[PDB]
Amino acid sequence: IASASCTTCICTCSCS
């Protein structure tokens, strides 16, 4: 629900 780089489709994922 809240993180960076790491899910399939909600909204974050990774990025630096």
UniProtKB/Swiss-Prot annotation:
The modification 2,3-didehydroalanine (Ser) is found at residues 3, 16. It is found in: Secreted. There is a cross-link at residues 8-9 ((4S)-thiazoline-4-carboxylic acid (Thr-Cys)). There is a cross-link at residues 12-13 (Thiazole-4-carboxylic acid (Thr-Cys)). There is a cross-link at residues 5-6, 14-15 (Thiazole-4-carboxylic acid (Ser-Cys)). Signal peptide: none annotated. The modification (3S,4R)-3,4-dihydroxyisoleucine is found at residue 10. There is a cross-link at residues 1-12 (4-(1-hydroxyethyl)-7-isoleucino-2-(threonin-O3-ylcarbonyl)-7,8-dihydroquinolin-8-ol (Ile-Thr)). Maturation of thiazole and oxazole containing antibiotics involves the enzymatic condensation of a Cys, Ser or Thr with the alpha-carbonyl of the preceding amino acid to form a thioether or ether bond, then dehydration to form a double bond with the alpha-amino nitrogen. Thiazoline or oxazoline ring are dehydrogenated to form thiazole or oxazole rings. Maturation of pyridinyl containing antibiotics involves the cross-linking of a Ser and a Cys-Ser pair usually separated by 7 or 8 residues along the peptide chain. The Ser residues are dehydrated to didehydroalanines, then bonded between their beta carbons. The alpha carbonyl of the Cys condenses with alpha carbon of the first Ser to form a pyridinyl ring. The ring may be multiply dehydrogenated to form a pyridine ring with loss of the amino nitrogen of the first Ser. Belongs to the thiocillin family. Has bacteriocidal activity. Inhibits bacterial protein biosynthesis by acting on the elongation factor Tu (EF-Tu). This is Thiostrepton. It comes from Streptomyces azureus. The lineage of its organism: Bacteria, Bacillati, Actinomycetota, Actinomycetes, Kitasatosporales. The chain holds residues 56 to 71 of 72 of the full protein.
